Amino acid sequence: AAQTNAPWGLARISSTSPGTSTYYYDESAGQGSCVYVIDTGIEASHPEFEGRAQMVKTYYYSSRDGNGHGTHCAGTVGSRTYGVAKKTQLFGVKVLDDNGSGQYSTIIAGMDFVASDKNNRNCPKGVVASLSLGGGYSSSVNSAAARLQSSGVMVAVAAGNNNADARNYSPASEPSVCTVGASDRYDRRSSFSNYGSVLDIFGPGTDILSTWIGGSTRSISGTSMATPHVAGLAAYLMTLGKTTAASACRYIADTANKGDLSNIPFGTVNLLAYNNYQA
């Protein structure tokens, strides 16, 4: 399948070169997989989700996304125009309030919620969780991310936006989950992207067009935007039967575009997520 005039990040993940604008992918498109977006919520009514999104949990007075961040991330995972895995099922878990903040205890509860809740959903091709959130190092937060992964969910987490070593952030620093740095459309490390040995992969994170609340769209930047590219990619590859929740991060690293990013610090992987789709 070919989507013309796609957002640059989608085109990038199906290309061996920067500078193209068409996204190529197998038409299976993550059908039969599920991605949990653990964030500020998802505006499921957005036409871009086509009825494939739903809120399953909130820790606040509403399950609505009053912020936008979660809706943008979910759009990059799975919206019809802005998404990597255009036929996945999207499940929203609102651990972040409408100001984008959340207590670590709530975030932990949301991770453990997903590990159990997947048993209430139909995801024959597999389950992914996208965590575009984080804070300072916490062993309890890392352990929750590790449990979620152990339970059979492909966990993708943002590296963080401090232009610093991600070893000092959680859940970024958890070794058993897939930690995602950000790049720009010229294959440069994004200016704000964290780095370090704990990173597993880079994805598009600068100037990413996706869904927003009020049935709208906008372009924003962050490792929050790179993470759902990787989560959507995992769902897509799992639907194709190429990998599993436990092995997908390694598979994505194995099949990445290698050595193509600039300003990668010595000791950080130079790997850019790539679907290796041959039309």
From Swiss-Prot:
Active site, UniProt feature: D39 (charge relay system), H69 (charge relay system), S224 (charge relay system)
One cellular component (GO) term of this entry: extracellular region
Entry's cofactor comment: Binds 2 calcium ions per subunit.
Protease keyword on record: yes
Domain Peptidase S8: 7-279
Residue pairs linked by disulfide bridges in the UniProt entry: C34-C123, C178-C249
Binding locations of Ca(2+) 2: T16, D260
Keywords in alphabetical order: Calcium, Disulfide bond, Hydrolase, Metal-binding, Protease, Serine protease, Signal, Zymogen
Source organism superkingdom: Eukaryota
Protein's recorded name: Proteinase K
Whole-protein coverage range: 106 to 384 of 384
